[PDB]
Amino acid sequence: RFSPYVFNGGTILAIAGEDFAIVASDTRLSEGFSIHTRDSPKCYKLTDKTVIGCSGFHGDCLTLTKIIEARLKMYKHSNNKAMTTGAIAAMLSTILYSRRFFPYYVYNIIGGLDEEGKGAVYSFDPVGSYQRDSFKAGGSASAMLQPLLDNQVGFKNMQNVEHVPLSLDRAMRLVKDVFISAAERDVYTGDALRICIVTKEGIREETVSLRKD
């Protein structure tokens, strides 16, 4: 009989820089053993300093995005200012917990700048627990991406390697290389790569192709 959930795939990556943040995702929308479209980016520009990604069940991703954009306007006409990055992360946890006994099947990562101009990444769970990290990878290929970023960004399990902070240009080629390796071994990943870069000058977008099989 009727089951209210289905899985759609997707992979979301975020990296908190020193004065930037990079949010990337693929554009493939799949179901079962089919491809619905090859053009469906998971990035969403909330403000000029905050980008969210949404994976999982796609019908909840469309609903949850429209709830957040309504409450941004409800904040602004009531408080005469836009929300911060940390205020959205505090608001979203209440929204996700509000349907505790019929949950959203959505994995969420919010990347953006703080009030000091530094990067900030907040990971989530489908019930609404969150924490601030430096980098997270969510979605279907999440297990294929966390061990590599621990090596390169976190410098874990490395001996006598100095800790230079990640520059912007070095962080770009790390993002472009992890999805090429992920598209080889994961079937829910490919067809494009939409990358959003949040700086103190606006939000830049960039698209890199992947393999189409």
């Binding site: 306007k73 409800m74 006409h77």
Partner: protein
């Protein structure tokens, strides 16, 4: 005078006096002027000080990215209709994923204010809304009234002593459809200065200007960006 107590009671002449009294509450507020070109709808209001050092009470307030309203009358019914106004705009964004047509938003207000003008137990809304907007068919200037008779118009001025602004607008309404953004604004604030006693001047701290444009989001200016508008004026013809 015995018929002059409730909204329910008709008069022996057919005129309900309680609606006639709420018209008089609109004349207690200050004057405000709205007008439009083919491409730009500009409404300009006049602030009023409470004391010498208190801030001036605001008039123009943002509603949506393509609609902003002015105000005249009770501040109780001002925010009460505003909260109903903002709620309907984001519902069309949530459901239909389009902005509202400005014309059918105002028909919701007339249905809103109709019921407290007929059932007993609630006064009419003493309020003086002027509405500027952009649907797909260009700019609009609307006014309402506590008798719920909303009017489409091309220029309008309501509030205290606002007749002198209307007489200015009738002899310049032919000029309004062709001018650009710049003198359209200072066609409008040449009309407010006849709603002033001739001994004081329209300064920076007492006037607000809101503009919504065909490619321009509704923007409220106050006290600092009014100075690019107040330049290029003549004195009063005394």
């Amino acid at each position: 005078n015995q018929y002059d107590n409730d909204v329910t009671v008709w008069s022996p002449q057919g005129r309900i006096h309680q609606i006639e009294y709420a018209m008089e509450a609109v004349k207690q507020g200050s004057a405000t002027v709205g007008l439009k070109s083919k491409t730009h709808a500009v409404l300009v209001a006049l602030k009023r000080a409470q004391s010498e050092l208190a801030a001036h009470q605001k008039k123009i307030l943002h509603v949506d990215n393509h609609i902003g309203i002015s105000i005249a009358g009770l501040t109780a019914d001002a925010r009460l209709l505003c909260n109903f106004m903002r709620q309907e705009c984001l519902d069309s964004r949530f459901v239909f994923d389009r902005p509202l047509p400005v014309s059918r938003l105002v028909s919701l207000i007339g249905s809103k204010t109709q019921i407290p003008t007929q059932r007993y137990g609630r006064r009419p809304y003493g309020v003086g809304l002027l509405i500027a907007g952009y649907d797909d068919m260009g700019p609009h200037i609307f006014q309402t009234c506590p008798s719920a008779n909303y009017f489409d118009c091309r220029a309008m001025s309501i509030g205290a002593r606002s007749q002198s602004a209307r007489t200015y607008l009738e002899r310049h309404m032919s000029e309004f459809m062709e001018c650009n953004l710049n003198e359209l604004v200072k066609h409008g604030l040449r009309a407010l200065r006849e709603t002033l006693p001739a001994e004081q001047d329209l300064t920076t701290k007492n006037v607000s200007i809101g503009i919504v444009g065909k490619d321009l989001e509704f923007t409220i200016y106050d006290d600092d960006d009014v100075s690019p508008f107040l330049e290029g004026l003549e004195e009063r013809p005394q």
